[PDB]
Amino acid sequence: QEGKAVYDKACHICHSMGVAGAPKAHDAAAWEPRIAQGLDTLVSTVKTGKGAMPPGGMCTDCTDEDYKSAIEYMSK
Amino acid sequence: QEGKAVYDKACHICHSMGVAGAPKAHDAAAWEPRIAQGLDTLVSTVKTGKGAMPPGGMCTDCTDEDYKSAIEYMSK
Ligand code: HEC
Numbered sequence: 001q002e003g004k005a006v007y008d009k010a011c012h013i014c015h016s017m018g019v020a021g022a023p024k025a026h027d028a029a030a031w032e033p034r035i036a037q038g039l040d041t042l043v044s045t046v047k048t049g050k051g052a053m054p055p056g057g058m059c060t061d062c063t064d065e066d067y068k069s070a071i072e073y074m075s076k
Numbered sequence: 077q078e079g080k081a082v083y084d085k086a087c088h089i090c091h092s093m094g095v096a097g098a099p100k101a102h103d104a105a106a107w108e109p110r111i112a113q114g115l116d117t118l119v120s121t122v123k124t125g126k127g128a129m130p131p132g133g134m135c136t137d138c139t140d141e142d143y144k145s146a147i148e149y150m151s152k
């Protein structure tokens with residue numbers, strides 16, 4: 001594979017300029033628009049990945065309830 | 077509290093404050109001390125994962141040569 005092609009499909013997700021930051025734990029105001037999407041939508045996004053969040057959120061054995069509880073914890 | 081143990085196992089890696097940034101593509105000065113470790117050592121680190129980088133760097137089909145080429149591409 002071409003170095004730039006590997007970069008353009010995978011490594012750029014985190015190694016490019018202008019990567020979107022994660023909503024930080026206990027930043028209630030940043031979490032409000034996320035929580036408004038609904039917990040089921042947010043849990044699905046953790047499982048499928050988004051931007052610099054890899055699919056599964058680095059939690060190999062997380063249940064849906066584990067993901068929901070972690071989101072609730074971070075949101076306040 | 078519900079969610080804190082999951083957060084402390086997984087989500088804090090990116091959702092806490094003070095997370096180490098990725099060395100950015102074409103940031104030659106950031107890459108210099110990494111390249112000095114040896115390209116093979118950097119390839120092994122991508123495969124193992126490190127901080128907010130998951131094992132494999134989100135490349136499933138990358139040979140060691142594919143990883144080396146991607147690192148060279150980012151390094152200048
Ligand atoms: C976000 C989910 C990432 C993807 C996709 C890739 N990388 Fe990454 N990388 C990332 C972070 C946050 C860091 C810094 C880690 C730390 O805590 O220091 C890195 C670092 C590297 C390094 C340097 C390793 C070192 O010992 O200094 C290399 C060589 C590296 N990353 C290569 C790499 C390649 C080739 C990827 C695409 C296949 C790739 N990374 C994806 C975050 C992320």
Ligand code: HEC
Pocket residue numbers: 020021022023034042043045046050051052053054056057058059062067070071082083086087088089090091128129130
């Ligand atoms: C870095 C490797 C991450 C880990 C581990 C987890 N998350 Fe994450 N998350 C991260 C980033 C960079 C972002 C922003 C994505 C973007 O581009 O918008 C996020 C975002 C979330 C979201 C919000 C999704 C949305 O559509 O706005 C949620 C609900 C989320 N993250 C939850 C979550 C949980 C529960 C994790 C532990 C199991 C977790 N994340 C880990 C980066 C990373």
